[PDB]
Amino acid sequence: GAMNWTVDIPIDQLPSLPPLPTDLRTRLDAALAKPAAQQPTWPADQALAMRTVLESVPPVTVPSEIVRLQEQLAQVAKGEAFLLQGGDCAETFMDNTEPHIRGNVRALLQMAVVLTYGASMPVVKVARIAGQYAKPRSADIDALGLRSYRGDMINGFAPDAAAREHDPSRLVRAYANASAAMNLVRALTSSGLASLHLVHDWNREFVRTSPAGARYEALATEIDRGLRFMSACGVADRNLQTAEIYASHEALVLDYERAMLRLSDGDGEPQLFDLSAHTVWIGERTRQIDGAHIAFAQVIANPVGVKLGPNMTPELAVEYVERLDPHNKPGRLTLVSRMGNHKVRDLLPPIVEKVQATGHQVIWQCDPMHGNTHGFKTRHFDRIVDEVQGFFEVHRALGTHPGGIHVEITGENVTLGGAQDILAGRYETACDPRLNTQQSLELAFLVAEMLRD
Amino acid sequence: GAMNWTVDIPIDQLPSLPPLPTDLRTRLDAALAKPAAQQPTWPADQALAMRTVLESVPPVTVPSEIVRLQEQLAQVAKGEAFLLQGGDCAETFMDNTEPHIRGNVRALLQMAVVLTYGASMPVVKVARIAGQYAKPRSADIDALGLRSYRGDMINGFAPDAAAREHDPSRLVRAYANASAAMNLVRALTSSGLASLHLVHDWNREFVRTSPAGARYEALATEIDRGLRFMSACGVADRNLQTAEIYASHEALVLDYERAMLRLSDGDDGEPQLFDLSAHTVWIGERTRQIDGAHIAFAQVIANPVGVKLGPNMTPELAVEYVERLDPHNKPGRLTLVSRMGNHKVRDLLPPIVEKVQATGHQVIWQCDPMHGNFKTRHFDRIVDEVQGFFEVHRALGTHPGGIHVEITGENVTLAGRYEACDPRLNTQQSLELAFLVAEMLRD
Amino acid sequence: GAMNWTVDIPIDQLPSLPPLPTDLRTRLDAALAKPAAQQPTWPADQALAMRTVLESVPPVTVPSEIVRLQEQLAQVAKGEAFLLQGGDCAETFMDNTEPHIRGNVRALLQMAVVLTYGASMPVVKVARIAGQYAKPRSADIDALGLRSYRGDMINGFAPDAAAREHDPSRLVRAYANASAAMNLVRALTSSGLASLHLVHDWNREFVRTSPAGARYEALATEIDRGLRFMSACGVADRNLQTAEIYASHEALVLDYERAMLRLSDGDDGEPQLFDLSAHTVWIGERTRQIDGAHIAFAQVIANPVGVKLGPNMTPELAVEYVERLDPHNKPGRLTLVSRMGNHKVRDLLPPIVEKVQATGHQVIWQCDPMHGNFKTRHFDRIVDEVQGFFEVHRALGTHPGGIHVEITGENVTLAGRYEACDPRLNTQQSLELAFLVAEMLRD
Amino acid sequence: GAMNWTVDIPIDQLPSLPPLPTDLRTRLDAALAKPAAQQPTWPADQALAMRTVLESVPPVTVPSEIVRLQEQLAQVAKGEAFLLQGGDCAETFMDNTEPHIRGNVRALLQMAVVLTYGASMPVVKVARIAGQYAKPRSADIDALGLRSYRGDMINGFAPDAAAREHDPSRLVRAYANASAAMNLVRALTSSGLASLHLVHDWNREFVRTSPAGARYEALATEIDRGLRFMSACGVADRNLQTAEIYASHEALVLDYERAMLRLSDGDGEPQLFDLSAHTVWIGERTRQIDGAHIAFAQVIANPVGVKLGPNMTPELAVEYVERLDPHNKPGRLTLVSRMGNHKVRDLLPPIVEKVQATGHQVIWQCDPMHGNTHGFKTRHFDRIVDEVQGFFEVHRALGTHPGGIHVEITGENVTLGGAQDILAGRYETACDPRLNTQQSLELAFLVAEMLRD
Ligand SMILES: N[C@@H](Cc1c[nH]c2ccccc12)C(=O)O
Ligand SMILES: N[C@@H](Cc1c[nH]c2ccccc12)C(=O)O
Ligand SMILES: N[C@@H](Cc1c[nH]c2ccccc12)C(=O)O
Ligand SMILES: N[C@@H](Cc1c[nH]c2ccccc12)C(=O)O
Ligand SMILES: [Cl-]
Ligand SMILES: [Cl-]
Ligand SMILES: [Mn+2]
Ligand SMILES: [Mn+2]
Ligand SMILES: [Mn+2]
Ligand SMILES: [Mn+2]
């Protein structure tokens, strides 16, 4: 009933399923009693109401997928597979569309083909998708004098007061959008978009028309010839038709992640899983060792990652390892270094040494974005490439596994600067400069060479 | 906002759709200008706004799955596969939960094992799920004097006036629930719920504890032995770990179906319109007016479609459906869904089949043994309608191509456990029917 | 030369063998210095010359197939596969032809389908073929007063003195015939004769025209339905197109077996000796002297081996065989082949099984229902020995691991069609036995 | 009973199977009434006796294999697969040993891996093995004053009179040796020797230790990376474990090839097949258009090839096409050019044009040996490579398919001259210089480059 230009969709009040068990609830309550940074400031009663809704909705992922990912990540940890993680820096509800989702899935796949060939081993494909709807902020008041935008799960991007109020109905809107995206993602990956031959064709079309193309023709051709070799040998080409794309996001809004907790079915044992995603990580600003995010990560069975910035000490890294991998399950923990290209060569070696000596097997993954940011906020492609380069140099020097990358990207032709010639044009992100389709593929070729190198 | 128990969606600055090929536009407007039975009566302007929202959401299904289905249904049409369709008579937002969905997916898969074994050919598995949120009514006002319940996509089940107001915001709720359900059925089918060995284990648990169990032990053991045979022969079994479950519902609310249209990139001779609210949809008895909106809408979409055929069907009208809906003679584009009562199917269906077979088109003949037979149905009349249906086809040499059944995973009933519709067979009776029909397929 | 109906092979400038690892040499000479029963009596010098020829020919089988077999037999030993061994009682050079070989391969495969279905687990298929050219005799002189026929590897079947002279040149003829037969069984099994669907079709033709057919229709149909189930589930079926048929014979003529030894490149802890005249060989009742050449020879080769156990077997001797021949406790290296008469198997076999099971070694228990029961055998006593054998294992909780049977593709019998041995079951009776044993496996 | 050093093995006289049918026999008799060049000169009665023996022995190959090869050759003819044919120039009974047979099968496989990768399409693998026991001679009396050696099927290599008498018992000895070799070949190819990963390892070991190695490191590495790509993608690696190696030889001794004729089983129709081999070809000296070899080829259903030398006219080639492919079955006929590297660029184009205009699809295959022969008879590697090079140049100029190679080789480290530095050392052939293991693999790398080229 609006003169508004807004439809109001009623949130159906549906009877609840039985509660989670008690031991697990006591554990959980004790974890969530810890202080949590960067939480939305909506009322408790509204929060509980919205949580209750989410407690009975169909999950975004199911436990047995997560168990599967855990096994695949174990191989990454042991130096036999490589982790590729990429997607929007922030999803918006506005752009949570087929074209945009297709675009990101295809950019990620395109990268995966090149990395799989370059690494010469399987690539675990993890999208920042289907829930990356919440972000920290350091500042309470933005350049316009407004409450900061904290992502669509918390408030709206529009530069006005009303949009910036923290509204917990966005938890439900968030769930609907994540669920819908994930449905699309499963559909696309199982019905042809993730066909290897098709994906590499896009790679050839890139090499043929990009101004940088010439640089990557040899490797592109070599991949092509790899592929044809497979037909030529008459392989059962079934596993070439589909690919698995896992969902991930920063676990930031605890009202959301706790509402999406589920207990798996007996057949070992039933465990607590966060079914909002397949894997989640904890950001720089919320990884307080005695805070609720880390404690939450302790209780869930999903694989998890922690972002490690320039202030990290090898001692604190070791504590993360002891809190988050208390059973020595290889690949249950990923430590994600993001330090800046100027710093990674010095800062990372001691951390790796100290963590390796623990006997635990973590995944070392490089986030070359969140360390290299300087009208618009932009990042230089060269400094991005160089951080991955240094990251590889650390591991090669130490005999450890450079296990993957974490990268912020899109399928759109946006405008980061320096792929081939680069901002006022197409700066579309609701956050950080998002390394357009062409740059992420270039990075993939450059990292492939670091792997053959 | 939360305070008001609503999610507020702004419509201005929503991603729009590109313009249709002039000609699809024209054809689609022409189809929808025709009269449409059983439509909700909410205001145009509110409907438009809701449609505009759905025009920008992720689809429930994608074109290439629907194209894959079409090929699988072509095998059925040709007498080389069998179609099993089943699920809730009506889904409700209140039961759109992980256990309820698991249960239905399980029940369906359990049927499919038994049917696959008894048919000796693949079974195309289509659930009534992720959209079966709208039903027709013969009366406007019900037994309590209220505006009839028409399914959660239109109004609410509660017995009060305000709950029965037609609410367009239910288009968007219906979408969210559908796509959430679809996400789950894809996850489950691809990650272990659809493992053949696990599914038959439940059949074995049913045979061993149902009071009917005895009756079906022999067949259940034979199936078990057939499965073990597969390991014994070392046949490579990724294909035994997953199954495909396609989504379907009655295409009833044209405001919903039209908003979920999308255009393919093309490839068999140009761009097509696909209804991406489902993989396949059918048109019911009360909306199949030959020059009505629903039939004409079915003509403009690429999806496979079916049409329910009741006791007053003539062979001539059946032929007209076939010529309108299968104008290119694509096997399996059209399913004729017979629902006639077990007392009538033996007499009424043969002439229809003969006339239609003489057109040279290859439809799927599917038996809906429910909608012809508290409101309850006798199991024996249901089984008997499928039995009569099988006799017709045996007599004529035609393919008895499938069944369409209304069921659940729940232990439903009579005052005991009656749960938004006509009476499902419960999970047990579904399985039992599957066993019974597998004997029809063997005999 | 042709004029003399001979092929002339020069021995000087023949490719020699490299020297054995000193230690295999020593062990092999020690084994062969032991006394050997049932050996041909031809001159040393002629034997040596023939051996020298065989030392340089292509092997009949290669080490890695024998290693593959060992792994498949380990599954049998563990109660997870079943061993079917069968073929001519004695091959003859005169029947070593494409139709006769096809027939036997067919009959064996036909049995294997039925057994695979009835066992509900893989069947390891081992033919008596490509070398079963030597037999023991209890008498030196036969009913006609002639030196007994001992198989075409030693002398001729014709009833005359010159034909019964032991002729060492038969070692080389035996090799040529064996390797020619093996070539054919590999070709046939890999190129369509071993297609599961084609093989069951013959079973279906048997059920439909044998006068016994009625008896086996139910099972044959169940199998057929099990097969169709496999297509129906879309399971990928290269594995349904081919089968492995392993070669075996009684290791009897030590001049032959020793000349066909070859040395592996190694890999489980050094180089081994493999008898490449076959994949697997067994030692008969009359040559299994515990401190004799044959047993000691079996100890020096890597192949899987079996030993025939007759009515006078003690549990203690059985244990000694097991400790000598399976000294490393490798499941499936050793097959104990029980052959006791149907009147005796129920009493004599349990104690043997118990004692041997208590050693913690895992042998394969195989039933040879022939050699314990014109010289003819009653089908009913044969079936009954396998039946008794199954009862023993059911009673003890042990695996009834397989059968060893003497058969053919030919329509043999009694004065009508008697064809170099004891009476085979003919092709029909083999199949019938397979059906009968598959019921034992199901029941 | 010898003071001789010879064992005499009796040839068992075994009852016969039913005869071939009559139509097919009349056809056959009329074919064999034609004159035949280069036949052994043993008596007719001895010949018939030995033929009768061979008529009932188990066949060397079976019809359904041959049908399969026909289909695979159809794809070669249509430009979608590549034919590799190689082995001993002449097999001997002496060397018909496991080591030697393993050696040749592995050399052929090693070639196939490189060619399969370079061609980017399947390679049909055809050995000169299991019957290549007979050769033509131009001269009646050799340099020693003896009747020429005509191969082990006909007489013996030893420089003495008695050995050189043509003895038809060698038909049976030939059959036994061919049968035994073929048995080995099936065993090896089905049980691990033909495993792709294993074979390429030998290729890497070659690249690492050959003095030419350095030349081929890039391609070798690129293949390796192709292979690892296959694991990395998780392909059903079953078709990587085994390979098909067909048997072939020159059909020269008609007493042999006719004795090995068999009629296939009904299920189209039963046909005459020569089961001494999978495919056979007719040499330069026996391809008289109205002779028995060509007529024999007409009656059998096997795929066949004809060698085409420098005297070939495009007209005569067309006649071969019309006699031997009268039903237009693609790949039933292979025309095998062997012209010399100095001549192939001029002589071959007109032949191809004239044959292409017939509408038939033959396979064009290059025999770069039998045209480049000059104490010992040797061939220069460079002239061998150059003929293949020219052969490719003809087809590239004409838009036709360069369909394969036919090459004489071995697994032995023999001494041809010029792989890396090359005769008195290891000249072991009973015929023409046989291009040792290392040279044939080098040729394979060089031809691979012609295919990517
Ligand atoms: N399914 C395999 C191979 C594959 C299919 N499509 C892909 C797309 C990109 C990379 C690899 C693939 C994998 O995921 O690795
Ligand atoms: N994938 C095959 C076999 C199969 C797997 N799981 C199943 C469950 C039910 C029936 C069949 C199956 C199919 O869906 O048909
Ligand atoms: N390859 C499987 C299945 C099979 C193929 N052909 C067969 C013939 C008989 C029995 C089984 C089979 C096996 O040999 O066991
Ligand atoms: N079987 C496939 C792949 C293969 C297996 N082993 C090989 C050896 C060489 C070349 C290819 C192969 C083929 O023959 O092509
Ligand atoms: Cl009221
Ligand atoms: Cl006498
Ligand atoms: Mn970011
Ligand atoms: Mn209904
Ligand atoms: Mn016997
Ligand atoms: Mn030559």
Side-chain angles (χ1 to χ4, degrees), chain C residues 1-3 5-12 15 49-50 53 56 58-60 62 64-65 68 93-94 96-99 101-102 169 172-173 175-176 179-180 182-184 186-187 191 238-239, chain D residues 5-15 17 46 49-50 53 56 58-60 62 64-65 94 96-98 101 167-169 172-173 175-176 179-180 182-184 186-188 190-191 238 265:
Chain C
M3 214 73 168
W5 286 86
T6 67
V7 162
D8 303 337
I9 296 158
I11 278 142
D12 62 319
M50 300 306 322
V53 171
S56 66
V60 178
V62 293
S64 95
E65 299 177 317
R68 204 214 297 122
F93 299 167
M94 104 152 202
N96 196 37
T97 67
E98 196 280 343
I101 292 149
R102 266 188 48 106
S169 72
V172 173
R173 278 135 87 179
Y175 164 70
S179 73
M182 200 59 232
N183 185 57
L184 190 52
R186 293 171 186 285
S191 61
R238 171 156 55 255
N239 222 54
Chain D
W5 286 85
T6 293
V7 283
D8 301 333
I9 316 307
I11 300 161
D12 292 281
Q13 329 200 42
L14 306 174
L17 300 176
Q46 289 175 224
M50 298 300 91
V53 172
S56 45
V60 179
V62 293
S64 102
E65 297 181 324
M94 188 178 291
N96 191 39
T97 67
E98 192 272 345
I101 291 158
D167 193 299
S169 61
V172 173
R173 197 177 174 190
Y175 164 79
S179 197
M182 193 71 232
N183 182 57
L184 189 49
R186 298 165 182 287
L188 289 170
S190 70
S191 78
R238 183 158 158 159
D265 59 42

Side-chain angles (χ1 to χ4, degrees), chain B residues 144-146 159-162:
Chain B
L144 308 195
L146 296 158
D160 68 273

Side-chain angles (χ1 to χ4, degrees), chain C residues 204-216 218-367:
Chain C
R204 287 192 310 114
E205 186 50 17
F206 160 76
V207 163
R208 184 166 42 244
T209 76
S210 118
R215 210 192 175 304
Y216 308 115
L219 188 49
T221 288
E222 182 171 337
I223 297 187
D224 184 64
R225 285 165 170 175
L227 274 158
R228 291 175 191 249
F229 195 39
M230 284 191 281
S231 308
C233 289
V235 277
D237 50 65
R238 171 156 55 255
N239 222 54
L240 301 187
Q241 301 314 136
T242 63
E244 291 168 331
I245 300 183
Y246 294 94
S248 85
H249 60 271
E250 170 177 354
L252 175 68
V253 173
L254 292 167
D255 277 325
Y256 188 74
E257 308 306 329
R258 74 189 284 175
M260 300 298 295
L261 294 168
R262 301 293 186 272
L263 192 82
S264 54
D265 36 67
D267 197 22
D268 51 290
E270 317 159 45
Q272 296 181 99
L273 270 181
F274 284 79
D275 186 340
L276 296 183
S277 79
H279 288 107
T280 175
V281 301
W282 73 86
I283 290 141
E285 265 290 282
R286 296 154 169 130
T287 35
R288 62 168 169 76
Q289 296 84 2
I290 195 70
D291 277 298
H294 289 90
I295 296 306
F297 179 82
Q299 292 182 306
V300 155
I301 61 179
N303 310 66
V305 299
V307 179
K308 302 292 203 84
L309 307 177
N312 84 334
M313 191 61 171
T314 58
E316 301 73 37
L317 188 53
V319 170
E320 184 72 358
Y321 283 127
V322 170
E323 294 188 329
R324 295 217 196 187
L325 290 167
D326 183 31
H328 299 103
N329 199 348
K330 298 295 145 215
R333 143 76 169 185
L334 182 56
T335 291
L336 294 188
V337 195
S338 154
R339 30 81 89 246
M340 266 162 197
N342 68 294
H343 46 308
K344 285 172 167 112
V345 67
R346 270 161 271 238
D347 308 313
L348 297 184
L349 181 64
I352 291 171
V353 175
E354 272 179 300
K355 250 302 175 176
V356 167
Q357 291 292 138
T359 67
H361 294 256
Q362 310 195 63
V363 307
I364 298 171
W365 298 103
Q366 179 182 43
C367 176

Side-chain angles (χ1 to χ4, degrees), chain A residues 82-86 111 115 365-366 368 388 403-407 443 447:
Chain A
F82 186 78
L83 181 52
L84 161 68
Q85 187 161 8
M111 293 179 74
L115 293 168
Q365 179 187 33
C366 171
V388 188
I405 58 172
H406 195 311
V407 120
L443 180 57
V447 172

Side-chain angles (χ1 to χ4, degrees), chain A residues 6 31 88 126 165 200 212 235 256-257 261 263 294 308 320 326 406 424 426 431 449:
Chain A
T6 293
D88 288 336
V126 179
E165 281 312 282
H200 190 57
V235 299
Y256 188 72
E257 307 300 331
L261 293 175
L263 176 72
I294 295 293
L308 306 183
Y320 288 129
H406 195 311
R426 285 195 57 175
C431 105
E449 287 299 348

Side-chain angles (χ1 to χ4, degrees), chain A residues 34 55 60 77 94 150 212 217 243 259 342 415 428 437 452:
Chain A
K34 274 168 186 187
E55 273 173 8
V60 179
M94 188 178 291
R150 313 219 212 212
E217 184 270 318
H342 48 318
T415 56
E428 256 139 31
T437 207
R452 314 161 97 210

Side-chain angles (χ1 to χ4, degrees), chain B residues 5 15 20 22 31 34 47 51 85 91 138 141 153 201 223 225 240 250 276 297 326-327 339 349 379 396 415 424:
Chain B
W5 286 86
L20 282 177
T22 310
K34 287 175 171 219
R51 289 198 278 119
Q85 198 157 1
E91 299 175 271
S138 37
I141 304 300
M153 183 188 285
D201 287 343
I223 297 187
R225 285 165 170 175
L240 301 187
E250 170 177 354
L276 296 183
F297 179 82
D326 183 31
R339 30 81 89 246
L349 181 64
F379 182 77
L396 284 163
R424 276 98 340 90

